[PDB]
């Protein structure tokens, strides 16, 4: 599983978390509807 990827293999988290990304889409929606 994910925790079993001990040896070497790792997964760096994305720079933009998928909760501040939702702010980007919120801004795009806010601009495109107003």
């Amino acid at each position: 599983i994910c925790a079993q990827k001990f040896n070497g293999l790792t997964v760096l988290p994305p720079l933009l978390t998928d909760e501040m990304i939702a702010q980007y889409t919120s801004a795009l929606l806010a601009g495109t509807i107003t």
Partner: protein, 49 residues
């Protein structure tokens, strides 16, 4: 160096359900996970460093 199986890690209490006739865990992939204590007959989890 459990019973000749050299390695490194941290040994903790195991909640596994080992039947009384095993020596190795090897839960997933090809990595040993739990080892029966040769002179205690207790299961020790192995987590790498």
């Amino acid at each position: 160096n459990f019973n000749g199986l050299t390695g490194t890690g941290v040994l903790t209490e195991s909640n596994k359900k080992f039947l009384p006739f095993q020596q190795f865990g090897r839960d997933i992939a090809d990595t040993t996970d739990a080892v029966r204590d040769p002179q205690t007959l207790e299961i020790l989890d192995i987590t790498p460093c």
